Amino acid sequence: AISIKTPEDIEKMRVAGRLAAEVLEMIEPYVKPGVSTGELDRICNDYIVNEQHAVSACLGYHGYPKSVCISINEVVCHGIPDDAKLLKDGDIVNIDVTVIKDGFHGDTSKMFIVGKPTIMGERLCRITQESLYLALRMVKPGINLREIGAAIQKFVEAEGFSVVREYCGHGIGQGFHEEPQVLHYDSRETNVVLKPGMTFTIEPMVNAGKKEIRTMKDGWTVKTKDRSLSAQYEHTIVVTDNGCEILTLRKDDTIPAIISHD
Ligand SMILES: N[C@@H](CCSC(F)(F)F)C(=O)O
Ligand SMILES: [Co+2]
Ligand SMILES: [Co+2]
Ligand code: NA
Please tell me the distance from the alpha carbon of residue 156 to that of residue 25, in angstroms, as a whole number.
26
Phi, psi for 10 (deg, rounded to 5): -60, -35
Phi, psi for 58 (deg, rounded to 5): -75, -35
Q: Which ligand is nearest to the CA of 93?
A: 4
Q: Is 41 annotated as a binding residue?
A: no
Strand order in the sheet with 243-246: 178-182, 169-171, 199-202, 235-239, 243-246, 258-260
Q: Is 53 annotated as a binding residue?
A: no
Decide whether any atom of ligand 1 lies within 6 Å of the 107 Cβ: yes
Please tell me the distance from the alpha carbon of residue 53 to that of residue 46, in angstroms, as a whole number.
10
Phi, psi for 134 (deg, rounded to 5): -55, -45
Q: Is 203 annotated as a binding residue?
A: yes
Please tell me the distance from the alpha carbon of residue 129 to that of residue 112, in angstroms, as a whole number.
12
For CA atoms 212, 215, 216, 222, the dihedral sign is: positive
Decide whether any atom of ligand 1 lies within 6 Å of the 168 Cβ: no
Give, in order, the Cα–Cα distances in Å from 3 to each of 170, 238, 258.
12, 12, 22
> Would you list the DSSP string of 122-156?
HHHHHHHHHHHHHHHHH--TT-BHHHHHHHHHHHH
Decide whether any atom of ligand 1 lies within 6 Å of the 203 Cβ: yes
- Burial 144-178, CB ≥16 within 10 A → b, else e: ebbebbbbbbebbeebebbbbeebbbbbbbeebbb
Element (H, E) at 169: strand 169-171
Please tell me the distance from the alpha carbon of residue 48 to that of residue 18, in angstroms, as a whole number.
12
Decide whether any atom of ligand 1 lies within 6 Å of the 92 Cβ: no
Residue spans per domain, the chain: 1-262
Closest alpha carbon to 128 in 97, 153, 100, 99: 153
Please tell me the distance from the alpha carbon of residue 68 to that of residue 31, in angstroms, as a whole number.
14
Method of determination is: X-ray
List CB-based neighbours of ion ligand 2 within 5 Å: 96, 107
What is the second-level CATH architecture of the domain 1-262? Alpha-Beta Complex (3.90)
Residue 259 pairs in a beta bridge with 244
CA of 45 to the centre of ligand 3 (A): 18
CA of 58 to the centre of ligand 1 (A): 6
Decide whether any atom of ligand 1 lies within 6 Å of the 205 Cβ: no
Atom of ligand 1 nearest to the CA of 98: 1
CA of 110 to the centre of ligand 1 (A): 13
Q: Where would I find the H helices in the chain?
A: 7-27, 37-46, 119-138, 145-158
Please tell me the distance from the alpha carbon of residue 237 to that of residue 137, in angstroms, as a whole number.
11
Closest alpha carbon to 130 in 152, 108, 111: 152
Please tell me the distance from the alpha carbon of residue 244 to that of residue 262, in angstroms, as a whole number.
13
Please tell me the distance from the alpha carbon of residue 181 to that of residue 162, in angstroms, as a whole number.
19
Radius of gyration of the chain from Cα atoms? Answer: 17
Please tell me the distance from the alpha carbon of residue 58 to that of residue 257, in angstroms, as a whole number.
26
CA of 145 to the centre of ligand 4 (A): 25
Return all residues near 123 (Cβ < 8 A) that are at least 6 apart: none
C-beta separation of 207 from 230 below 8 A: yes
The backbone region for 158, taken as left when phi is positive above 0, alpha when psi lies in -120 to 50, beta otherwise, is alpha
Give, in order, the Cα–Cα distances in Å from 251 to each of 21, 26, 132, 147.
9, 11, 17, 29
**Beta-strand relationship, 104-113 and 69-72:** unpaired
CA of 216 to the centre of ligand 3 (A): 20
**Beta-strand relationship, 69-72 and 222-224:** unpaired
C-beta separation of 102 from 53 below 8 A: no
Resolution at which this structure was determined, Å: 1.8
Please tell me the distance from the alpha carbon of residue 64 to that of residue 141, in angstroms, as a whole number.
35
